[PDB]
Amino acid sequence: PEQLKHCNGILKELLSKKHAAYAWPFYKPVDASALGLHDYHDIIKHPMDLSTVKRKMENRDYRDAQEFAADVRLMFSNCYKYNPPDHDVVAMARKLQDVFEFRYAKMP
Ligand SMILES: COC(=O)C[C@@H]1N=C(c2c[nH]c3ccccc23)c2cc(OC)ccc2-n2c(C)nnc21
């Protein structure tokens, strides 16, 4: 209960303007067609993004904090999985994950 309330606050920061410089690629699902990706959905089997997490939050689909954090980390993993480590989107994912993992750790 109060746990899921904290998760809601974390999500607002990930979407806040303070982190928009490196968090924008994760606002909406990967549009493989718009990006020219031909193997994204064959390799990434369970896509995830901040709007989908926000939706599941609003529909009260998360039962605890652990279920919420599982989706957020999966979002970063898909980015790490599909892209080589030298790509900048991986660096943006690492920057945003360090923000998430820090705030998530400071949860009561
Ligand atoms: C060429 O390879 C790709 O298109 C992969 C794709 N690239 C970026 C991106 C974002 N800054 C970048 C800098 C250099 C290279 C790629 C990028 C991107 C952009 C988006 O804007 C709507 C939305 C999703 C992503 N996104 C995610 C999340 N995970 N992978 C990708």
UniProtKB/Swiss-Prot annotation:
UniProt domain Bromo: residue ranges: 2-107
Further remarks about this protein from its record: Some specific inhibitors of BRD2 that prevent binding to acetylated histone are promising therapeutic molecules for the treatment of cancers or inflammatory diseases. ABBV-744, a small molecule, has been tested on tumors with success: ABBV-744 antiproliferative activity is mainly restricted to cell lines of acute myeloid leukaemia and prostate cancer and is able to displace BRD4 from chromatin. GSK046 (iBET-BD2), which specifically inhibits the second bromo domain, is a promising therapeutic small molecule for the treatment of inflammatory and autoimmune diseases.
Effect listed in the UniProt record for changing L35A: Reduced binding to histone H4 acetylated at 'Lys-12' (H4K12ac)
Highest rank taxon of the organism: Eukaryota
The species this protein was found in: Homo sapiens
Family: Belongs to the BET family.
Stretches assigned to coiled coil: none
Subunit structure comment from the entry: Homodimer. Interacts with E2F1. Interacts with (acetylated) STAT3; promoting STAT3 recruitment to chromatin. Interacts with CTCF; promoting BRD2 recruitment to chromatin. (Microbial infection) Interacts with herpes virus 8 protein LANA1.
Entry protein name: Bromodomain-containing protein 2
Name of the coding gene: BRD2
Function: Chromatin reader protein that specifically recognizes and binds histone H4 acetylated at 'Lys-5' and 'Lys-12' (H4K5ac and H4K12ac, respectively), thereby controlling gene expression and remodeling chromatin structures. Recruits transcription factors and coactivators to target gene sites, and activates RNA polymerase II machinery for transcriptional elongation.
Domain observations: The first bromo domain specifically recognizes histone H4 acetylated at 'Lys-12' (H4K12ac). It also specifically binds histone H4 acetyl-methylated at 'Lys-5' and 'Lys-12' (H4K5acme and H4K12acme, respectively). The second bromo domain recognizes and binds histone H4 acetylated at 'Lys-5' and 'Lys-12' (H4K5ac and H4K12ac, respectively).
Annotated effect of mutating L37A: Reduced binding to histone H4 acetylated at 'Lys-12' (H4K12ac)
Localization: Nucleus; Chromosome
